[PDB]
Amino acid sequence: MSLRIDVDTNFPECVVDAGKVTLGTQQRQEMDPRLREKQNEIILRAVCALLNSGGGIIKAEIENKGYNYERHGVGLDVPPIFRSHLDKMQKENHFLIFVKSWNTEAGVPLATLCSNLYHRERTSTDVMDSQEALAFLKCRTQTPNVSAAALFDRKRLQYLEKLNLPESTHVEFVMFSTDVSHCVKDRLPKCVSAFANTEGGYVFFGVHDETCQVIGCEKEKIDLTSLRASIDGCIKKLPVHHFCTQRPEIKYVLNFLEVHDKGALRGYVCAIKVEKFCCAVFAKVPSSWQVKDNRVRQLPTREWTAWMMEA
Ligand SMILES: [Zn+2]
């Protein structure tokens, strides 16, 4: 995903080139917020790169003139368990990070920025850190709420109507952004992944959470004929890895619950039912990186899972 970061393994240890970078605590906090993000990523991708390729050095070229190391801070957001591998240090208008081989620290065979393996415990959808996901992958490697489902095939609803049904491990209420497609096209896969991986459930799009109130969306800023297409294109795009023989699809069900107010046919709630799943469903492809042939290249989902199970 994203940008190409160039590395060259000449001589001994390989050297990832992070290029231009602003540094320090304070002056990375007065950066372009959409570039304190852009830079901090190339670092974390290259740190993870070498974590999974025996070790290396990241060469960075300092932007902010007159950086002083012991006096400006490092100002980089780095995963915690990564830091037990991180010797940082300066040299004129240039900065070096030495990455020691990951060497299966935590019993997890590799360094992963983000698993994209979600699961919804109690009232809350989190991703699993590579600790969590290693166990769930070990635990799915073996083969073999009623009110909620009444609401799922209602046919009318009332604006601001506060439903009886709290968010739980089977019920999640999420609210429409201004764009309906580019909200649901993004918020969905996390949900689908969560529910598939954790006992299945219902995502109610266009319902306030903290109050379980119906809301909806203007009956005109959405188009039910295409939103089912784009919804079905999104779910069949989800990366899944199978342990079993059977090998299904993700079984799911989409209903459009009309909102009303003053008998007036205004609005919409988007409901998706995701049935428990056989193996594992990723929201996108595990963010996880190696140094393969003079670029940092992302690990594909079949390899990332295999790589985690060498344990
Ligand atoms: Zn399966």
Residue numbers in the entry: 1 to 144, 169 to 335
Article, verbatim:
The Schlafen family belongs to the interferon-stimulated genes and its members are involved in cell cycle regulation, T cell quiescence, inhibition of viral replication, DNA-repair and tRNA processing. Here, we present the cryo-EM structure of full-length human Schlafen 5 (SLFN5) and the high-resolution crystal structure of the highly conserved N-terminal core domain. SLFN5 binds tRNA as well as single- and double-stranded DNA, suggesting a potential role in transcriptional regulation.
To gain high resolution structural insights into human SLFN5, we crystallized the SLFN5 core domain (SLFN51–336). The core domain (38.9 kDa) behaves as a monomer in solution, as determined by right angle light scattering (RALS). SLFN51–336 crystallized in the space groups P3221 and P21, diffracting to 3.2 and 1.8 Å, respectively. The SLFN51- 336 structure depicts a horseshoe-like shape with a mixed α/β topology consisting of 10 α-helices and 14 β-sheets. The domain consists of an N-terminal and C-terminal lobe with respective bridging domain. Each lobe consists of four α-helices and five β-sheets and each bridging domain of one helix and two sheets. The SLFN51–336 structure comprises a zinc finger motif with the calculated anomalous map confirming the presence of a zinc ion. The zinc ion is coordinated by a histidine and three cysteine residues (H266, C268, C302, C303) that are highly conserved throughout the entire Schlafen protein family. The structure of SLFN51–336 shows similarity to the published structure of the N-terminal domain of rat Slfn13 (rSlfn1314–353).
